[PDB]
């Protein structure tokens, strides 16, 4: 029977069923953004201490 097409952009496991590397790529992206956010907030703390 015909298969319902689900959007890989909004659905995660469909994106993985078509491309398993997207998982690792997204993990790297999320961790990188978290690290950068914490680094920026501590730099802001240092700047306000300098002020």
């Amino acid at each position: 029977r015909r298969v319902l097409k689900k959007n890989p952009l909004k659905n995660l496991r469909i994106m993985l069923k078509l491309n398993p590397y997207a998982k690792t790529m997204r993990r790297n992206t999320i961790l990188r953004q978290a690290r950068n956010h914490k680094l920026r907030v501590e730099r802001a703390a240092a700047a306000l201490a300098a002020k």
Binding site: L12, K23, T24, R26, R27, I30, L31
Partner: protein
């Protein structure tokens, strides 16, 4: 048989684990964990002995029948859905009942019950609302809190306790639970000036009053 262990992946976002495949291989330590390789019952009779089968074929077949369904996966019974609460609703907050026979009355919120219904009480001495279940959507949460943290509600009051049975007479355990909770909660609201009058009042809309304009 070993004792189960908490998952070694802390969830990063739902559906994704924090550690990679081989990283969790190492954490599990699977390098050193490598492994390699009724229908009838006999019953005596007072003759001989009869072998009785507990399953007997139907004595009637319907004229025609429906087929079995294709089976989906994400459909769970209501008893095990995830229950959500609005961030603006916290214990001790003042709510406004909007639908039922107690509509427009200000009440005190206590806890999220098991099935996602808020456990409102209301002081009987104030506005004649008892320990009562309410729906999260059909209430307006005002920004006025009571430090209810140090209040010990009984544990036996649950959804099965509050569910309808089938005139209606009130019961003694209902009355005594009401009395206990009221005796515990009233002195806490007597400490805030004019709050008993606020809870005794009734919410209504007058001319020139637009709900989107006014801050709750």
């Amino acid at each position: 048989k070993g004792k189960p262990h908490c998952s070694r992946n802390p969830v990063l976002v739902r559906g994704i684990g924090r550690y990679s495949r081989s990283a969790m291989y190492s954490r599990k330590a699977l390098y050193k964990r490598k492994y390699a390789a009724l229908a009838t019952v006999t019953k005596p009779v007072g003759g001989g002995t009869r072998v009785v089968k507990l399953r007997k074929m139907p004595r009637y077949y319907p004229t025609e029948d429906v087929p079995r369904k294709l089976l989906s996966h994400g459909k769970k019974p209501f008893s095990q859905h995830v229950r959500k609460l609005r961030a603006s609703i916290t214990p001790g907050t003042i709510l406004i009942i909007l639908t039922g026979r107690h509509r427009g009355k200000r009440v005190v919120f206590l806890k999220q019950l098991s099935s996602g219904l808020l456990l409102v009480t209301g002081p009987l001495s104030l506005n004649r609302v008892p320990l009562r279940r309410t729906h999260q959507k059909f209430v307006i949460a005002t920004s006025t809190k009571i430090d209810i943290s140090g209040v010990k509600i009984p544990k036996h009051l649950t959804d099965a306790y509050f569910k309808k049975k089938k005139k209606y007479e009130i019961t003694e355990q209902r009355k005594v639970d009401q009395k206990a909770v009221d005796s515990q909660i009233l002195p806490k609201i007597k400490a805030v000036p004019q709050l008993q009058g606020y809870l005794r009042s009734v919410f209504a809309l007058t001319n020139g009053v637009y709900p989107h304009k006014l801050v709750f």
